[PDB]
Short mmCIF file of C-alpha atoms and ligand atoms in Angstrom, two decimals:
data_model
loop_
_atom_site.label_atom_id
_atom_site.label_comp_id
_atom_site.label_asym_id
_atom_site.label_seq_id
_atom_site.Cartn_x
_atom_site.Cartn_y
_atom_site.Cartn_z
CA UNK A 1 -6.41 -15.34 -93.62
CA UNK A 2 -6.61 -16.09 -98.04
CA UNK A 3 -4.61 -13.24 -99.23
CA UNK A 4 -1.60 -14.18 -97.01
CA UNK A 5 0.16 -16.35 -97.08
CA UNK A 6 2.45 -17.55 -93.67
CA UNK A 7 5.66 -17.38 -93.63
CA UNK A 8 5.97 -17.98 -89.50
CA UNK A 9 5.06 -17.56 -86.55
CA UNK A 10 6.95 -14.50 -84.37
CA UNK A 11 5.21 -15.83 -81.21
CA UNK A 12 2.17 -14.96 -79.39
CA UNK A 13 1.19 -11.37 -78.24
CA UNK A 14 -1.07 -10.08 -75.29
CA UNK A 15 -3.90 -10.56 -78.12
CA UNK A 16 -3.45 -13.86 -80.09
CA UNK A 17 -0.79 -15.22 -82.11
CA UNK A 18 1.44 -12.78 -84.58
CA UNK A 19 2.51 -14.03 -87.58
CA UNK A 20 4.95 -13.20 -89.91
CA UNK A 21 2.91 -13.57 -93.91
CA UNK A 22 3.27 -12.20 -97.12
CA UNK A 23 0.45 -9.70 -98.83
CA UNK A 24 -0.24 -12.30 -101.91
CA UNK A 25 -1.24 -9.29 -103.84
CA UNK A 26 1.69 -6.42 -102.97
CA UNK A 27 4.03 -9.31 -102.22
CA UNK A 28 5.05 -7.42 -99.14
CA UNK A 29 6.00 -9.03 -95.72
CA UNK A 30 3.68 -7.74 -92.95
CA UNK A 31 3.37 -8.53 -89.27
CA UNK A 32 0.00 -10.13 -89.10
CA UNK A 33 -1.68 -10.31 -85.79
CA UNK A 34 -5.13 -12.71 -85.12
CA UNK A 35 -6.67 -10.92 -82.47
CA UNK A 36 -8.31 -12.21 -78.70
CA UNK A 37 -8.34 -15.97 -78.52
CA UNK A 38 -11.55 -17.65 -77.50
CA UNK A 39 -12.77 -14.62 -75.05
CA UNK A 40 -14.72 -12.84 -78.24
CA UNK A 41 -18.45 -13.66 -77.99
CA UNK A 42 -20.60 -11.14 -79.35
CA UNK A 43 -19.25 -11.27 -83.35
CA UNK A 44 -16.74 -8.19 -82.25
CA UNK A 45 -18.38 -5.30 -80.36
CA UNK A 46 -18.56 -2.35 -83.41
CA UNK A 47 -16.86 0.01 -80.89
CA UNK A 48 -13.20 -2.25 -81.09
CA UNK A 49 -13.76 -1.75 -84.89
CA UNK A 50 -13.96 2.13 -84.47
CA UNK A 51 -11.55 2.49 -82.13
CA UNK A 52 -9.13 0.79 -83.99
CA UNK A 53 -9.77 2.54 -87.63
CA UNK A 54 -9.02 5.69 -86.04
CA UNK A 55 -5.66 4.35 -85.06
CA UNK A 56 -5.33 3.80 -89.03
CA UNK A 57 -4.79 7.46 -89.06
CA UNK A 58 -2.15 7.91 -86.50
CA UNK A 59 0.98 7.73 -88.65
CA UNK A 60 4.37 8.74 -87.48
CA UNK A 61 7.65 7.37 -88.09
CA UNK A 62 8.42 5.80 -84.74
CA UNK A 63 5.01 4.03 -84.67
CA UNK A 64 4.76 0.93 -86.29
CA UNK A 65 2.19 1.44 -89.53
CA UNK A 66 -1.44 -0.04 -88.93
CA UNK A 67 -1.73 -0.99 -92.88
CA UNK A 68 -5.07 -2.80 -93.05
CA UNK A 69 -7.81 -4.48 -90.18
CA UNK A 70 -9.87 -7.34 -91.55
CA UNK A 71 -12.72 -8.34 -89.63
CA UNK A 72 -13.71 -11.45 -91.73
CA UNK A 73 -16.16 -14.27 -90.45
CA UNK A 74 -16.82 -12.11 -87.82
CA UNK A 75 -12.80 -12.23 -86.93
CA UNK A 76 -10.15 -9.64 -86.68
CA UNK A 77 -6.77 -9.54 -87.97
CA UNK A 78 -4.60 -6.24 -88.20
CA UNK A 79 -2.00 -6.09 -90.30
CA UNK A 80 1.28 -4.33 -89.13
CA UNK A 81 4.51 -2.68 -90.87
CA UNK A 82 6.84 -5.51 -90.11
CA UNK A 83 10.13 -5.40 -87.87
CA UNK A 84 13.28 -7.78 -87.31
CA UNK A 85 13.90 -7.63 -84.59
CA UNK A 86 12.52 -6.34 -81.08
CA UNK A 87 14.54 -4.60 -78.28
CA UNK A 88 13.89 -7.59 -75.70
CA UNK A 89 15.89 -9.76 -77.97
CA UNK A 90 18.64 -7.16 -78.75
CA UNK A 91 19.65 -6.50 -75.07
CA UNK A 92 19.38 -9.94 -74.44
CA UNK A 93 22.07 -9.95 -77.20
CA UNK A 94 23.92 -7.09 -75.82
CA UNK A 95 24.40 -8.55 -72.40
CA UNK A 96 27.95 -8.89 -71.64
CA UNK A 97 28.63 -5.56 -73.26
CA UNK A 98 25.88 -3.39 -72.87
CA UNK A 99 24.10 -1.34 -75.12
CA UNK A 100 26.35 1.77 -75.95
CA UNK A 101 25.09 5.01 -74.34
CA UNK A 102 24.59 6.90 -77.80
CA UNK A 103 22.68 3.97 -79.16
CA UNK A 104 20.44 3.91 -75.64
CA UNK A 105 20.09 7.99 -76.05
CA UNK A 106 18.84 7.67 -79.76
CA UNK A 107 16.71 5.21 -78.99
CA UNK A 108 14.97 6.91 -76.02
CA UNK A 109 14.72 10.24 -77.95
CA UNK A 110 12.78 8.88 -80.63
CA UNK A 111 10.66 6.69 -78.33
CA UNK A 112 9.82 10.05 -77.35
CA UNK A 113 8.96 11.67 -80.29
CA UNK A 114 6.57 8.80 -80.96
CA UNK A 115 4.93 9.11 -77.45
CA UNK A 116 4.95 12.85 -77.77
CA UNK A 117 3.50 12.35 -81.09
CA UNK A 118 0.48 9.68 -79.75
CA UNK A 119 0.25 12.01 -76.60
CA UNK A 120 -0.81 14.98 -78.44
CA UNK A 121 -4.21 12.94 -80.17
CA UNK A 122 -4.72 11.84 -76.40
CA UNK A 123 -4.00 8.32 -77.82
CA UNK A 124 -2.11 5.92 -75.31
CA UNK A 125 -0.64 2.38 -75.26
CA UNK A 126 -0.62 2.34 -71.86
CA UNK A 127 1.74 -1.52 -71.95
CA UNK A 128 4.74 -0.60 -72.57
CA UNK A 129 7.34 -3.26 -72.74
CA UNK A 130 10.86 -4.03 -74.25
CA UNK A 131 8.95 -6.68 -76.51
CA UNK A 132 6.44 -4.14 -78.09
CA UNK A 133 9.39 -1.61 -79.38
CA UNK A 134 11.05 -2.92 -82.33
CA UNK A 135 14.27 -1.91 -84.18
CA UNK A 136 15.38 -2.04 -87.65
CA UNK A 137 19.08 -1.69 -89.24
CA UNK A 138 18.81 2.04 -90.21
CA UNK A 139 18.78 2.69 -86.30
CA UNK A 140 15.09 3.10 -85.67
CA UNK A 141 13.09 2.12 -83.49
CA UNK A 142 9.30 1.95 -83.27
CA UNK A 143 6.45 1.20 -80.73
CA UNK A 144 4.43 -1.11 -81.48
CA UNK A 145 0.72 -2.35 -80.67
CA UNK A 146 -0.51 1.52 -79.34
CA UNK A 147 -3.54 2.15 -79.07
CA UNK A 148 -4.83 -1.61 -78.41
CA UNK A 149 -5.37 -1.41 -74.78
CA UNK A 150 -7.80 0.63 -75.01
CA UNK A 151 -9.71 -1.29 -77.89
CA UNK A 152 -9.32 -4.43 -75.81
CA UNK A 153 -8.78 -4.04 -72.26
CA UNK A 154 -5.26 -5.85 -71.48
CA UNK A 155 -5.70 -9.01 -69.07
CA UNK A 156 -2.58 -11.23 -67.32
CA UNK A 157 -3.14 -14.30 -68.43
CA UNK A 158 -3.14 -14.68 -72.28
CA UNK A 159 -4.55 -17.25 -74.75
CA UNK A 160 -1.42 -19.27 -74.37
CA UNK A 161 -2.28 -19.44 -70.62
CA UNK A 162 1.24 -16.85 -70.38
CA UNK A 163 0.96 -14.61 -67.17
CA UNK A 164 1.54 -10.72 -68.21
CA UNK A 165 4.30 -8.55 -67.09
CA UNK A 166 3.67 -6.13 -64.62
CA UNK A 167 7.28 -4.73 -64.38
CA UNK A 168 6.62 -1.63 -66.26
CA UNK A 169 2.70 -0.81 -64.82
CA UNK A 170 2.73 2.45 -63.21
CA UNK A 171 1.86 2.63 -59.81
CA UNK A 172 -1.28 4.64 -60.33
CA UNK A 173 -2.58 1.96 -61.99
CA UNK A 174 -1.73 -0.98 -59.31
CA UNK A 175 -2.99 1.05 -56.91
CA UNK A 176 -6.61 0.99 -58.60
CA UNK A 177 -6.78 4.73 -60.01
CA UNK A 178 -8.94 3.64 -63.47
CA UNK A 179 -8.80 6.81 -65.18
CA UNK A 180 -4.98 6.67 -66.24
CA UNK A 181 -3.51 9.59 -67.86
CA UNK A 182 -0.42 9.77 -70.73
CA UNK A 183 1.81 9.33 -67.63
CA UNK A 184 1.95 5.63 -67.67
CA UNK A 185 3.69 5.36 -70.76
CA UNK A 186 6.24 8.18 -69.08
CA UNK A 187 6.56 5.57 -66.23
CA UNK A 188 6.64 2.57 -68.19
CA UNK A 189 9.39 4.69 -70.72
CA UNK A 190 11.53 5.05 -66.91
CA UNK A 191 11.64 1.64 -66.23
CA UNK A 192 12.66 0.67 -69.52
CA UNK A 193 15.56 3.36 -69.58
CA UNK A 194 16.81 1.84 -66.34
CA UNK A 195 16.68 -1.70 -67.83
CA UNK A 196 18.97 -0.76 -70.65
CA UNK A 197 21.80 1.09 -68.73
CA UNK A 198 21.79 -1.43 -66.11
CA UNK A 199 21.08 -4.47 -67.76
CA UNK A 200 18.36 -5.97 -65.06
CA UNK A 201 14.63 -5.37 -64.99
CA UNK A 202 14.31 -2.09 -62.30
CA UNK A 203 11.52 -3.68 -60.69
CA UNK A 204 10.87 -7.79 -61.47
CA UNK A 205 7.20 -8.15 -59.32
CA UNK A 206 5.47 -10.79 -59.67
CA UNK A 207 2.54 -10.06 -58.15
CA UNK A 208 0.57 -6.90 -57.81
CA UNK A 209 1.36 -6.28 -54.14
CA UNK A 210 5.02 -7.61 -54.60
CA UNK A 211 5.69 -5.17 -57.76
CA UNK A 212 3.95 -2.19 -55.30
CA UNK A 213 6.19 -3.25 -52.80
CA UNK A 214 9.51 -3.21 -54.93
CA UNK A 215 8.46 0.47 -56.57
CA UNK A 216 8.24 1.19 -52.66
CA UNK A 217 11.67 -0.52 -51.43
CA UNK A 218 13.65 2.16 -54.09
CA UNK A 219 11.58 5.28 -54.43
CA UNK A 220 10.22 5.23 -50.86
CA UNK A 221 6.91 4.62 -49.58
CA UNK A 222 4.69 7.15 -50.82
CA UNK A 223 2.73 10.20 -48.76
CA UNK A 224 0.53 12.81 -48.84
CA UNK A 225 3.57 15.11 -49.32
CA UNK A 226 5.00 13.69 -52.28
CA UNK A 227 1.72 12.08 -53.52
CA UNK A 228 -1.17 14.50 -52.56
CA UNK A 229 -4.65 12.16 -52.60
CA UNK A 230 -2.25 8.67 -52.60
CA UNK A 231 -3.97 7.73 -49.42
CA UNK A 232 -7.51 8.13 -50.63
CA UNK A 233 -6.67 5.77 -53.79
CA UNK A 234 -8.93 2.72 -53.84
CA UNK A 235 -6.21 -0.44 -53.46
CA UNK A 236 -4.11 2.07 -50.87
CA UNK A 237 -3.92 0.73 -47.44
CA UNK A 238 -2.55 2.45 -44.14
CA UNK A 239 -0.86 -1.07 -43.15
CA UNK A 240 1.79 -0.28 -46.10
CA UNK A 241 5.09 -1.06 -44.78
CA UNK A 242 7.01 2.46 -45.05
CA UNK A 243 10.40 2.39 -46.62
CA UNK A 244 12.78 4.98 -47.17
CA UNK A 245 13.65 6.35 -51.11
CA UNK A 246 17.07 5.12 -52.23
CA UNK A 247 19.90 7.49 -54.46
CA UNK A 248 19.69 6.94 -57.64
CA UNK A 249 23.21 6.68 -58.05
CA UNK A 250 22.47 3.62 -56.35
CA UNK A 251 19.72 2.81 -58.25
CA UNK A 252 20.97 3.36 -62.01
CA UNK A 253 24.88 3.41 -62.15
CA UNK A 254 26.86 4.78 -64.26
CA UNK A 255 24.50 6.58 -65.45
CA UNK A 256 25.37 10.27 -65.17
CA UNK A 257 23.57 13.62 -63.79
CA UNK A 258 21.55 14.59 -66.98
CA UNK A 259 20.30 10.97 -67.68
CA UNK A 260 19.71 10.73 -63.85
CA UNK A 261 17.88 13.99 -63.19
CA UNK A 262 16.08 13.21 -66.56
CA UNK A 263 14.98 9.55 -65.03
CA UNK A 264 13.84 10.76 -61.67
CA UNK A 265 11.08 13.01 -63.34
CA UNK A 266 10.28 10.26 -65.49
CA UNK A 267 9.11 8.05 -62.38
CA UNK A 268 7.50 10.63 -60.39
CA UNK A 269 4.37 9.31 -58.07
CA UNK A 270 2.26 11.85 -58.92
CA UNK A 271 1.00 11.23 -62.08
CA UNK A 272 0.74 15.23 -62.45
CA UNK A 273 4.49 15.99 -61.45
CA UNK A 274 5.78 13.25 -63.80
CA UNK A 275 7.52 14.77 -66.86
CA UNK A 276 5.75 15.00 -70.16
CA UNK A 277 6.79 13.10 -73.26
CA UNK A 278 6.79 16.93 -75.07
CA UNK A 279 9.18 18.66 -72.03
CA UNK A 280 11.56 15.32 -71.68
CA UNK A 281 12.46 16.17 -75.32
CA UNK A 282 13.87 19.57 -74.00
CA UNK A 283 15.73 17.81 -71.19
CA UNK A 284 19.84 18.66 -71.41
CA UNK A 285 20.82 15.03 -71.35
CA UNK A 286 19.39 15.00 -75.08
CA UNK A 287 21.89 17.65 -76.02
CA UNK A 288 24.56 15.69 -77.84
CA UNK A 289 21.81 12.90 -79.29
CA UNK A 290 22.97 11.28 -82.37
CA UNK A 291 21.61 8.55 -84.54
CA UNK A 292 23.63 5.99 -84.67
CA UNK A 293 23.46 2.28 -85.98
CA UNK A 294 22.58 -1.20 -84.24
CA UNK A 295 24.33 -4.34 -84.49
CA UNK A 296 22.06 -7.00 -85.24
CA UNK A 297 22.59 -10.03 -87.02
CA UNK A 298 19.27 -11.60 -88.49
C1 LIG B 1 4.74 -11.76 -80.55
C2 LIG B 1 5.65 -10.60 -80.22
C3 LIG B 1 5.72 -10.30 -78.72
C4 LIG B 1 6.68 -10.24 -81.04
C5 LIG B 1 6.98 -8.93 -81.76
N1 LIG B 1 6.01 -8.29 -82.67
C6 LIG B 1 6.30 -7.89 -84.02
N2 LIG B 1 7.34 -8.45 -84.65
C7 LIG B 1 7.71 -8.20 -85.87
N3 LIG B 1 7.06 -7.36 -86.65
C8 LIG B 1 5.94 -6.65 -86.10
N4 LIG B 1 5.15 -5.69 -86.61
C9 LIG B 1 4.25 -5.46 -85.62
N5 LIG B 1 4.46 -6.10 -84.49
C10 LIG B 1 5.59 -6.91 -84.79
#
């Protein structure tokens, strides 16, 4: 765009390339983002365009600020609050220490006031990831690129030809329910809770079937009892290996009983039984929450 000018690139999102630019008029640095590479044929259907205004609206602190969308030559750019740094890089930075449990239980309280926040305008992001959640020096954090999804529905292999990460995809979704509910982003919220206490990706697929299969492996294959209508779901078949459900103690050491009884409602099957952004905020392992501050070095 004219009234920006670039000041680098921060890499390449699900939707196009996301640079990092200076507002030539404000003079302040924003997180611009080009949107859909090449797949775009039509001149941009009006109905992205409203979608995405109404996410204009949808301020809170732990969502990162939509400040301005410029479709221009029949183009798109939104133009975010801009971060340093994002939480894919900082455990990557914290990984022969670990990310201290206060720090890990600040951040996931007020990645829950965000969702609770979205969750109440029936808004979702629905691809959550360690990438789109971005920190500052304060001690925030803040999730980025909601809303999106729905204005352009997310596909695997991007512009850059990069193959998507289904590590965090509920299972509702791979196993072809299409009218998702705000329990994804509870599931997706799970995984990445388990990622930061342990350090490794919960469960690395990397393929539809093989991330099913992996879910299945820990939490068990799931039935009729725990799942009521699993079997009818479209991609469900009766030839599903049938594995038994591991301990979480197992699963996410050392993490203790509240944080453990707090992530086992979190990754529920049933999309109905799984704990609600609003009721996790009540959970007893929030109790003692602080806010306390990062160490990042930019
Ligand atoms: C390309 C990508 C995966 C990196 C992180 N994205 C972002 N990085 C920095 N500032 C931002 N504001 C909005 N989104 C932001």
């Amino acid at each position: 765009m004219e009234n920006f000018q670039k000041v680098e690139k921060i890499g390449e999102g699900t939707y196009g390339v996301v640079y990092k630019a200076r507002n030539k008029l404000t003079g302040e640095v924003v997180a611009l983002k080009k949107i859909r590479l090449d797949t775009e044929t039509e001149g941009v259907p009006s109905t992205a365009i409203r979608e995405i205004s109404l996410l204009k609206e949808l301020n809170h602190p732990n969502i990162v600020k939509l400040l301005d969308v410029i479709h221009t030559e029949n183009k798109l750019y939104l133009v975010f609050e801009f971060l340093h740094q994002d939480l894919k890089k900082f455990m990557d930075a914290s990984a022969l220490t670990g990310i201290p449990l206060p720090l890990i239980k600040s951040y996931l309280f007020q990645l829950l006031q965000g969702l609770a926040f979205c969750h109440s305008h029936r808004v979702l992001h629905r691809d959550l990831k360690p990438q789109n959640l971005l920190i500052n020096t304060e001690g925030a954090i803040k999730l980025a690129d909601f809303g999106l999804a729905r204005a352009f529905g997310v596909p695997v292999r991007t512009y850059t030809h990069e193959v998507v990460t289904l590590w965090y995809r509920a299972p509702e979704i791979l196993l072809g329910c299409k009218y998702y509910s705000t329990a994804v982003d509870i599931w997706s919220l799970g995984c990445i809770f388990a990622e930061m206490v342990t350090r490794r990706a919960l469960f690395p697929g990397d393929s539809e079937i093989d991330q099913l299969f992996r879910i299945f492996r820990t939490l068990g294959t799931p039935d009729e009892v725990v799942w009521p209508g699993v079997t009818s779901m479209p991609d469900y078949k009766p030839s599903f290996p049938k594995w038994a459900r591991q301990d979480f103690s197992k699963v996410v050491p050392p993490l203790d009983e509240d944080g453990r009884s707090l992530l086992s409602q979190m990754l529920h099957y049933d999309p109905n039984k799984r704990i609600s952004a609003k009721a996790a905020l009540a959970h007893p392992f929030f109790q003692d929450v602080t806010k306390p501050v990062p160490h990042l070095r930019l």
